[PDB]
């Protein structure tokens, strides 16, 4: 594509520079170019891809929420607020479609190790969840089921192949719990998942080095924060 003439190593180096410069749209474009080289991504490279797109879509989601709130207030008791919310929504859908397209061509198909496969299936669940946040049409239930299916496959692999303190397994559980609460209208499933994940991780902390303990406890605190918000 647009980054087709740049070396893969140069795209990765530029993604790291764009991260330092807080240029997340450029970071995402460099990482999309690196994925399109066709080689599998290392752990560090998967995290650069996810940080780039999370920041891009996070800005879009924050803008969409502001616009949706203004639109809802305008329809209580011109077309511009709806038109601009729709423009932001279409741009957000475009970014989610781009990420889902990279996962389907061909990141997931080539991911055989649990660390890579769980990471990409978590990403697939997350980007379908962002599509679900703005969905209204005939495909809304199918978008929610696509998020659920990706998260469930990731969970099934993570439970068989990773320890309960693995940060990818923990982050998957945190996000799938938020999917249950916010998207699937299943608050009890959300709370049960967050609580079991927290408790199973706590019981495995004794096996960890100081650095791994820090990584796992950081995500466990997010599970506890959600449990405090919900209970």
């Amino acid at each position: 594509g647009a980054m087709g003439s740049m070396e893969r190593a140069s795209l990765i180096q530029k993604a790291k520079l764009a991260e330092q410069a807080e240029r997340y749209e450029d970071m995402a474009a460099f990482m999309k170019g690196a994925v399109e080289k066709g080689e599998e991504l290392s752990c560090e490279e998967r995290n650069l891809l996810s940080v780039a797109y999370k920041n891009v879509v996070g800005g879009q989601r924050a803008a969409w929420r502001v616009l949706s709130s203004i639109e809802q207030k305008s329809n209580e008791e011109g077309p511009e607020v709806r038109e601009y919310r729709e423009k932001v929504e279409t741009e957000l859908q475009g970014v989610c479609d781009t990420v889902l397209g990279l996962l389907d061509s061909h990141l997931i198909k080539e991911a055989g190790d649990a660390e890579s496969r769980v990471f990409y299936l978590k990403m697939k669940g997350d980007y379908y969840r962002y599509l679900a946040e703005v969905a209204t049409g005939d495909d809304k239930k199918r978008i929610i089921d696509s998020a659920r299916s990706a998260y469930q496959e990731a969970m099934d692999i993570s439970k068989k192949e990773m320890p309960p303190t693995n940060p990818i397994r923990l982050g998957l559980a945190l996000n799938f719990s938020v999917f249950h609460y916010e998207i699937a209208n299943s608050p009890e499933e959300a709370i049960s998942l967050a609580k079991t994940t927290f408790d199973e991780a706590m019981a495995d902390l004794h096996t960890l080095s100081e650095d791994s303990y820090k990584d796992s406890t950081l995500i466990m605190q997010l599970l506890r924060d959600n449990l405090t918000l919900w209970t």
Partner: peptide, 5 residues
């Protein structure tokens, strides 16, 4: 909003 990673 709840926390996600």
């Amino acid at each position: 909003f709840p926390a996600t990673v």
